[PDB]
Amino acid sequence: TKPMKLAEVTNRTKTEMEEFNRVLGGGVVPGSLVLIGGDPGIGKSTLLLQVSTQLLYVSGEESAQQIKLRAERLSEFYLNMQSVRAEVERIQPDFLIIDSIQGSVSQVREVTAELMQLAKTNNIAIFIVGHVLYFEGFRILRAVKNRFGSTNEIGIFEMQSGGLVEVLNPSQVFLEERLDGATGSSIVVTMEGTRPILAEVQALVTPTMFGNAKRTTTGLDFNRASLIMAVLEKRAGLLLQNQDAYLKSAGGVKLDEPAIDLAVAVAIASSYKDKPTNPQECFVGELGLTGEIRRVNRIEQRINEAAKLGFTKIYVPKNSLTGITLPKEIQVIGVTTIQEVLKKVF
Amino acid sequence: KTKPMKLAEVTSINVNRTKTEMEEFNRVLGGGVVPGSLVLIGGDPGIGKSTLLLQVSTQLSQVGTVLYVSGEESAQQIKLRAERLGDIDSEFYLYAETNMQSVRAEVERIQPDFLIIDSIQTIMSPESVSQVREVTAELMQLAKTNNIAIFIVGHVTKEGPRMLEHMVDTVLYFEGERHHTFRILRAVKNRFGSTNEIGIFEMQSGGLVEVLNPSQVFLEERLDGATGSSIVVTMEGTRPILAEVQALVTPTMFGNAKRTTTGLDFNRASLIMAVLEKRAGLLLQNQDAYLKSAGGVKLDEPAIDLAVAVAIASSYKDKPTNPQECFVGELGLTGEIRRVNRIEQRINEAAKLGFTKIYVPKNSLTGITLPKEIQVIGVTTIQEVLKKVF
Amino acid sequence: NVNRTKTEMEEFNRVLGGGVVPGSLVLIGGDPGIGKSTLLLQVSTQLSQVGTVLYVSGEESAQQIKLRAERLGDIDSEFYLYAETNMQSVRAEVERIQPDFLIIDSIQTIMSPSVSQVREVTAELMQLAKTNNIAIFIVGHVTPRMLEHMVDTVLYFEGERHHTFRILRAVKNRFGSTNEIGIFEMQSGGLVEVLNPSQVFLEERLDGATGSSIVVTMEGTRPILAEVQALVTPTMFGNAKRTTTGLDFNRASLIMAVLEKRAGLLLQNQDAYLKSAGGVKLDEPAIDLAVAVAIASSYKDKPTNPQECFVGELGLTGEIRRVNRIEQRINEAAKLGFTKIYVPKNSLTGITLPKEIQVIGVTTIQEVLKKVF
Amino acid sequence: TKPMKLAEVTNRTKTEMEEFNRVLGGGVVPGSLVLIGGDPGIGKSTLLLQVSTQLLYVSGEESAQQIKLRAERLSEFYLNMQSVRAEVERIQPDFLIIDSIQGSVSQVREVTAELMQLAKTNNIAIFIVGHVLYFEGFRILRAVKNRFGSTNEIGIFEMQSGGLVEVLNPSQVFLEERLDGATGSSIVVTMEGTRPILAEVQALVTPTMFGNAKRTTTGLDFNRASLIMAVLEKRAGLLLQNQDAYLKSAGGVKLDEPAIDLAVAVAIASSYKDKPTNPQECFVGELGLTGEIRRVNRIEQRINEAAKLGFTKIYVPKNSLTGITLPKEIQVIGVTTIQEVLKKVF
Amino acid sequence: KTKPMKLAEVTSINVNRTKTEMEEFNRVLGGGVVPGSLVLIGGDPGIGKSTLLLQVSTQLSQVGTVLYVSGEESAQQIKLRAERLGDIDSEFYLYAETNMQSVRAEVERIQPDFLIIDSIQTIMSPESVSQVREVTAELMQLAKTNNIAIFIVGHVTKEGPRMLEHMVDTVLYFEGERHHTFRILRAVKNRFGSTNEIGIFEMQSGGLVEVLNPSQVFLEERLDGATGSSIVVTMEGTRPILAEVQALVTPTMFGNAKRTTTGLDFNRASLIMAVLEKRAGLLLQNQDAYLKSAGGVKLDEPAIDLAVAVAIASSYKDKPTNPQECFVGELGLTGEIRRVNRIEQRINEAAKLGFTKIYVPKNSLTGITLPKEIQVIGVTTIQEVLKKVF
């Protein structure tokens, strides 16, 4: 390209899989190199076979007969680089898939350089498998580097007996898991670096029978929980002095971020009170020792992620909202104190 | 070229700088963008260096000619971003290409007053990591061939931005922690200005919004009858981080008095309480204490002692502290407020974030010039401080 | 048989072993921000009064240095400033002006066909000191230890977080002693020398401040000087408390047992809080005596002298055992303006003692506490 | 050399320093390369200046005038390699010293290869300094690799105001340190890998005043000490139940070897009993839970090292002595039970 | 050279081996020294590989011709050592030189039946670490050119002996822990013998003295009324280490019953005691327990459970165990004695060190051939064991 004025800047092949299209930023662009990365066993061959049967598949990893058995469960689909190049000029295929690019590993860098120049010689879309998209564990496909789209885009799949089944409403995973009015469960939109993870905090508050009141956490910092309880007793007015408390992060998610405080406070209160929370409402906020609900980082991302996963309410810190556009699919409730929240929730 | 010259005959700078609508960004560069200069913006990925440079560029395109070079994002991607940020009916040129030879050719053609390289890591040349040091050397010589201002972006990686700091004209760092919603732009090295200058910005849905008057954020963040909150100007190496200590002192009901900290060393707090009881006279023997560093900031430096002593006392006493006053000082076991390192930097940083008082150790002030925007109170004992504060 | 150039700064002269030797390479090392540029600008404005100075650096601009250097000294004298980087352009100006003193403000910021190559530039600088017979100063920001073996004098400008002293020490000196130190304090103007350091230790101490004592400990080979703090107070509750910060808890526990069983202090029913001032970790046998004296001082409510310090491992029989590097510790104490130092008596066998400090060899803890209180 | 029958295999320059001679295996051999290693500041220049004034000294590290000031406190002593080689042929010196051999560091390997060939061209002894002998902290000089002697040889020095003073009786270091009949001190010949270190164990047994009996160690494993006390109470009959115990390894030596058990038991008993041990007697032995004194590794080395440092008795495990020659300067007492030892000692 | 051959027509070995006076060393090599073969002796520095090879060489010089090549020690040094060890009025040649080209020339000249390389690390050649693999390859071809037995020494280093194990004829390991006064020589790989063979030696003032009858060492090491001692055949990776567990059970006097371990995991011992109380019926609630692994051997393997249960019971009961019986087995919380890995190796190792009984888990024995020198008792429950033992 040549430099170009910004006042003068502005189509793709879609698949039946809505999620896979969003990740590529609309669909498959005809002249690029797309790399799918992930651990072996995850389903990069399975995902590419499914995209291919919808849209020349080259594999050294599995045999021709093996792929036929796989791909029927899941038209002009055709199954070293010098012997490959000859077939690219002959059939002239719009889409080329290399199942496993894998001193071959030193030569891997030199093969992919020659594949990017091959995308220009014959204007074709080429998929490369690396044992930039990353397929990692439900199953998620995320765009790490995208030249023809946004990197914040995600595609959720679940591997079943047939192959990969796309996931539209991931709110229903927590909703199926919710029992008939089960207390002491709450939801937080936490962060694993930049990825917003959505997680369930669990509490079992029960009166102590003997001597010292027990406190036990799994997945949350113990001392963080200890302070939360002091703030609930001193600010919210819950008599937790003589109550045992067991706390758990469902999944074995480590929850080590200030934003999880409010969800843990609400979980405990829910168990103490024996009043359930809504399974489509979630909570985000650091809790100060004065009862205040302090600001948190990346609030816009958290609200976005909650809405997308089918949540209806989200309690956020009120100060965090200054000049942020809120999505129409989710009720954002800014709160300022813990008392205010527990009043609203119970 | 420049010549060896006697210092008495060294003439004062008579530059022509280019200002942007962002008052803060100008102060940092020491007045504005100096033409024929190399400015490096460092910081973690995601903070908003591209966003800040796109905003600066859309403003500079109104008076000069901008060439924005990005290998990192595509041309179409940037157009979607930059329309939210500003106006681009002006001479703002975009070039999504990575080889310096192909860039050089376009610099001679359009002759742009301002050049931006979005990610030096993503610019190649013959002879993506080692070769960054050689590209920036060629960029400094390019600033003199055409007399243009050039901005360089340096993402701070786990391993292999701090390497180029000694060979560029201005070094800026864009940093903004998980605990603060606000991002700060600081000048680490400035050849055309002061290094104590800072620019506060808050990333909003549109892009980065400047925070002129930050004293209003701390006042909004405090509740009505706040108590047991205090502020310390701590240090994360050389970066002065400003942090809130929280204390909940409440009488014990049970047998043993509880002590629980999060973010502060437990034993450090234990000693502080002993010094408050034995020197200041607070009956804390039968009081539970919960202590928290707001934000999840680890506070592991002697200077935090006074702020924690004041926090506790504030909760014990049920008397609030001022939200625009902060405290710096190691506390000795005799009640003394001992000296701390980098006092001048801490007082500077407090003043810039809109603080009105700062309690410092009295011994630390020997021959230090104090900024006129902040009241520096040197103290010697903990009793003295608590008398002053409550 | 040598003719050195002195500066008005007595301390900086002692470090170089009398003054600036002409035709020599002196490397100043340290962290960034300590004041190597500031110290060299101050020496340069003084040396410009007798010789001819050429100050080179690309780290800061010419105009920036003028604003700094007017606060620091006088500039009506032959002081030349050259904000260049590459060498070949420098060499040409050395032959022209023929300057007696050359300063390179960051060797990291100089190129010749900018860290690996740094070794080759300093080799060419040492041969340049013979071609023109000039004194040359090299600055090495510590991120400097690579050039230490190939230069004439190696200075390190050091400053721990607890002391606002900024000490200049000679690591390797071809024209002087390596024991020499120069104490400075950075003030608003620039670096102010500290000629009587004895007066600083006598501001950091309050009036009735008991339980403070001083130890000359070691951070590898660097003798660090540190303050141990104790608060002994009667227990109110059931169990007597013991809490340390910066000292090993179990080490302190034994010290108290020895003070109760040997020295006769009733500490059983006393709470004890101990702290190493500064956040210095004190993990060396030599700190035992200072901690014992600290505790006793707080217990007894009798202060120690602020210009006396204590060195010695304390045995469980009350004995004050030998410690390593005793000659270095006595030397460092003396240089920081201390008047007494209690050392183990056995450590003194055939060691020459400096005339500026009273070295007291002790054998038991009872003996020490008798002497001290 | 050519291969040679063993039935057909069989002089040096000595210095006034008996210790330095032993290390080199008799004295300085005229045609070899001796490397002295150690940390900077230790005294390798000081030791070589002292050997040289007794026996061409080449230094880039210090100036000529600096060395003259040093060497007078401490005859035909004369003070890059091409300029050096020319002076070796001229003066023809029997002994050559290179003060600091220190991309010079890559070239250091190539210079020392040329120095070993220089030892043959002109049959001379050459000393090399490396910032195989190792000088490490009293101060010790040990032979790591010796072609003309034993590697177990050691030379003890003490740096004083003049320079390095040799140490003949290191028993007198512990003897000066011993007070007038001080109880609860004992000596062990332990091992730091293969180096036999000689160390002092200290005990303060004193009756408990309140509630629980205290146990505190520094330098010894706490649990090891705990077991020792159980064995002393159950086998030896010491009523330690109601006694506090403070234990210390003098020097900050870590003592983490089974052989230290007996010394610790004797230390405790000495403090309990208020009866001192002899300062020239030492103890070696693992203590079993039945009271037995079990065998230990490297017994011959330990007895050797004790004797050399001027010890008069050594209590060892009786089983360890099977077919071992005992040095005439030290009384080796083989013991079998802890009761037997305490009977003998007190 | 050798040829592809049908297994029915593969003829049995008809070698001529050379025996030494050391019965143990012969067994290890599978009868004696095979001519035209490469034997590697591995082990930590200081164990006595040079000492063992000097002793073998002084014995082999009586029937063949030995060439001992050492770069590590000098010729004069070896003469002082080797006179204490044996007789050298015989054809024993010593060559203190390190380059293989200079060695080869002397092999063709003297034509020695036995060649010893003292430290392969200290032998050089063109093209001291990488090049060891190429020297040993040239040494195996040298064994066929002249038909000689060659011994190679491999010191086991922190980092960079186990590398050559796959490319030599016999692999021996000389190992002897800080806790045992005795050193053991084991065959890891043997082309001319069994790998289960072992040679026990004790280093004495002269040199290495063989330990034929080791059953006498364990009996001398036990006191008269020993009690609370038991023996386990544990594993340090693949090396079967044989270890002594010690227990002192004694009634509590104070409030809380004490439990203290050294060398065993505390919690593992705690469970064992619970299983002894609940299944075996020992009243340990009010008994203190001190447990020790003799030697400072870390015992962190499930197989040690039974030995620790037997130790405790022996001390509780005040009834000794036999010093020539040992125990192997994980103990389940139901009192069951569960299976363990490498049972055949453990039974072998016990037998070789002169043990007469070994209690093993009964399930582990399915189709395993048992050595005739040791009584293998398969057990199923802890009650069963204690019944048998006491």
Ligand SMILES: Cc1cn([C@H]2C[C@H](O)[C@@H](COP(=O)(O)OP(=O)(O)O)O2)c(=O)[nH]c1=O
């Ligand atoms: C399509 C398909 C795959 N599989 C199995 C076979 C594969 O080895 C396994 C993993 O899928 P695959 O896509 O081969 O993993 P990757 O390419 O990421 O290494 O799933 C089924 O069991 N049933 C199916 O229908």
Ligand SMILES: Cc1cn([C@H]2C[C@H](O)[C@@H](COP(=O)(O)OP(=O)(O)O)O2)c(=O)[nH]c1=O
């Ligand atoms: C300008 C803008 C950026 N963003 C996102 C896209 C960017 O990838 C992300 C981070 O900003 P960016 O400036 O790209 O970060 P870096 O410091 O790494 O250059 O913010 C929005 O969501 N909305 C916006 O209006």
Ligand SMILES: Cc1cn([C@H]2C[C@H](O)[C@@H](COP(=O)(O)OP(=O)(O)O)O2)c(=O)[nH]c1=O
């Ligand atoms: C001389 C002087 C310096 N300074 C500042 C400017 C310098 O950049 C800073 C640090 O000193 P500097 O000597 O540049 O540190 P170094 O060269 O060791 O890295 O001190 C003042 O604030 N006031 C002054 O009067």
Ligand SMILES: Cc1cn([C@H]2C[C@H](O)[C@@H](COP(=O)(O)OP(=O)(O)O)O2)c(=O)[nH]c1=O
């Ligand atoms: C000989 C001697 C040395 N010294 C000092 C100067 C040296 O820098 C220091 C260390 O000795 P040196 O032998 O130079 O150490 P090394 O060669 O091992 O690095 O001892 C004295 O103070 N007095 C003396 O009489």
Ligand SMILES: Cc1cn([C@H]2C[C@H](O)[C@@H](COP(=O)(O)OP(=O)(O)O)O2)c(=O)[nH]c1=O
């Ligand atoms: C033969 C013998 C060796 N030794 C010593 C010298 C040796 O360096 C040391 C260790 O034996 P050595 O066989 O050299 O060990 P390695 O396994 O490393 O070859 O034992 C004696 O003290 N006395 C002796 O009679």
Ligand SMILES: [Mg+2]
């Ligand atoms: Mg696959």
Ligand SMILES: [Mg+2]
């Ligand atoms: Mg960016």
Ligand SMILES: [Mg+2]
């Ligand atoms: Mg500077």
Ligand SMILES: [Mg+2]
């Ligand atoms: Mg030296």
Ligand SMILES: [Mg+2]
């Ligand atoms: Mg050997």
